[PDB]
Design an enzyme around this catalytic site. Sequence first.
Site, PDB file in Angstrom:
ATOM      1  N   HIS A  70       1.066  -1.199  -0.167  1.00  0.00           N
ATOM      2  CA  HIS A  70       0.056   0.057   0.092  1.00  0.00           C
ATOM      3  C   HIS A  70       1.036   1.460  -0.208  1.00  0.00           C
ATOM      4  O   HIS A  70       1.895   1.197   0.800  1.00  0.00           O
ATOM      5  CB  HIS A  70      -0.845   0.049   1.001  1.00  0.00           C
ATOM      6  CG  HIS A  70      -1.483   1.256   1.520  1.00  0.00           C
ATOM      7  ND1 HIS A  70      -1.212   2.044   2.894  1.00  0.00           N
ATOM      8  CD2 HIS A  70      -2.291   2.192   0.890  1.00  0.00           C
ATOM      9  CE1 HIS A  70      -2.005   2.968   2.815  1.00  0.00           C
ATOM     10  NE2 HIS A  70      -2.682   3.363   1.738  1.00  0.00           N
ATOM     11  N   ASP A  71       0.578   2.185  -0.783  1.00  0.00           N
ATOM     12  CA  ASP A  71       1.306   3.312  -0.970  1.00  0.00           C
ATOM     13  C   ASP A  71       2.799   3.056  -1.411  1.00  0.00           C
ATOM     14  O   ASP A  71       3.838   3.595  -0.541  1.00  0.00           O
ATOM     15  CB  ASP A  71       1.190   4.327   0.149  1.00  0.00           C
ATOM     16  CG  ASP A  71      -0.076   5.434  -0.318  1.00  0.00           C
ATOM     17  OD1 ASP A  71      -0.328   5.423  -1.583  1.00  0.00           O
ATOM     18  OD2 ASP A  71      -0.673   5.911   0.828  1.00  0.00           O
ATOM     19  N   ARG A 113      -0.050   6.184  -5.888  1.00  0.00           N
ATOM     20  CA  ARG A 113      -1.180   7.280  -5.895  1.00  0.00           C
ATOM     21  C   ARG A 113      -0.209   8.497  -6.173  1.00  0.00           C
ATOM     22  O   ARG A 113       1.036   8.554  -5.933  1.00  0.00           O
ATOM     23  CB  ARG A 113      -1.783   7.185  -4.285  1.00  0.00           C
ATOM     24  CG  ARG A 113      -2.378   6.040  -4.151  1.00  0.00           C
ATOM     25  CD  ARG A 113      -3.052   5.812  -2.586  1.00  0.00           C
ATOM     26  NE  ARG A 113      -3.460   4.592  -2.406  1.00  0.00           N
ATOM     27  CZ  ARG A 113      -4.782   4.383  -1.841  1.00  0.00           C
ATOM     28  NH1 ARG A 113      -5.551   5.249  -1.220  1.00  0.00           N
ATOM     29  NH2 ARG A 113      -5.022   2.864  -1.363  1.00  0.00           N
ATOM     30  N   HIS A 162       1.576  10.679  -1.152  1.00  0.00           N
ATOM     31  CA  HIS A 162       0.829   9.963   0.090  1.00  0.00           C
ATOM     32  C   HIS A 162      -0.232  11.260   0.285  1.00  0.00           C
ATOM     33  O   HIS A 162       0.156  11.936   1.322  1.00  0.00           O
ATOM     34  CB  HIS A 162       1.303   9.468   1.221  1.00  0.00           C
ATOM     35  CG  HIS A 162       0.364   9.210   2.233  1.00  0.00           C
ATOM     36  ND1 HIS A 162       0.386   7.780   2.673  1.00  0.00           N
ATOM     37  CD2 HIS A 162      -0.450   9.644   3.074  1.00  0.00           C
ATOM     38  CE1 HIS A 162      -0.639   7.718   3.584  1.00  0.00           C
ATOM     39  NE2 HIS A 162      -1.171   9.036   3.845  1.00  0.00           N
ATOM     40  N   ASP A 165       0.827  -3.029   4.393  1.00  0.00           N
ATOM     41  CA  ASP A 165       2.090  -2.043   4.609  1.00  0.00           C
ATOM     42  C   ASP A 165       3.257  -2.665   5.117  1.00  0.00           C
ATOM     43  O   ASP A 165       2.964  -3.682   5.637  1.00  0.00           O
ATOM     44  CB  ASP A 165       1.554  -0.994   5.978  1.00  0.00           C
ATOM     45  CG  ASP A 165       0.416   0.249   5.476  1.00  0.00           C
ATOM     46  OD1 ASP A 165       0.399   0.648   4.278  1.00  0.00           O
ATOM     47  OD2 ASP A 165      -0.307   0.499   6.462  1.00  0.00           O
TER      48      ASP A 165
END
Length: 304
Positions: free
Chosen positions: A29-30, A66, A79, A280
């Site tokens: 994630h990210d 993102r 982010h 994460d």
Amino acid sequence: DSLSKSPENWMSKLDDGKHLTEINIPGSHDSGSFTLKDPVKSVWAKTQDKDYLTQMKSGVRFFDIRGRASADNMISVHHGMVYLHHELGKFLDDAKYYLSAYPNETIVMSMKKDYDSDSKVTKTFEEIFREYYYNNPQYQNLFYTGSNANPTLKETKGKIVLFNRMGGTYIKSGYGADTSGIQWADNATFETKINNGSLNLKVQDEYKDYYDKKVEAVKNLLAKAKTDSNKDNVYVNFLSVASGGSAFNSTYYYASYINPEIAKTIKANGKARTGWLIVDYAGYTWPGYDDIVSEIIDSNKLEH
């Protein structure tokens, strides 16, 4: 030996006749936030410590990119408001490098607008991505450009498959690549048809959940995947959760609990279908505890 023993090329050991949807895929994630060093900021804005190449070496095949349009020809990795110190090209170049080194892997790259464009920008985010990256001769051959809504590993290996979180697009290949895009419900578990009805996307993305509710929402979707052998169904399940709570608890702190709890659940399920589980601190190990990335990889069943 276990597939999780060779994370750098685990996909190369599967039946390439599998639809990507049917593969249990670890995601980060990210993904790009490993560049963050500011400790005050990192509590809530940092989600990874491995760089992209090291995440790939570790078996991550789904990347949550993102972005923010920061010039009419440039997307910066973000982010939310926080700039992550590089542009999308850097991700692409690393992906392209990794894929030529390991050409029987595929990467799914999710692309989302995470913040308002810089004030000089005169083009939409989707147009900039389409013209300056997807269609850019510089990245010729890197992206999946097939017309199949449900591609197999054979037709995607060596390439990046777009997972479209931009909205409607004129791009025609990848998940949600059409003029509707993907209807994403905020902080929710939901289900929506994508690719002109061809696929049913099932998502758990309750990113503001407190701990117990998050674990319960990850397991609820996990339990669904296990019962579902339908290839036209796609599961995306984010274990990642937003910072906050009793002290001012970091995204790391939560990952240190959730990752082992889900790793263990999956391990106890043996070879059950999991869907694409987005985490994460992908690759971050804690002596004594099952590793989420490793268990996602090992949950794949080799039948060939």
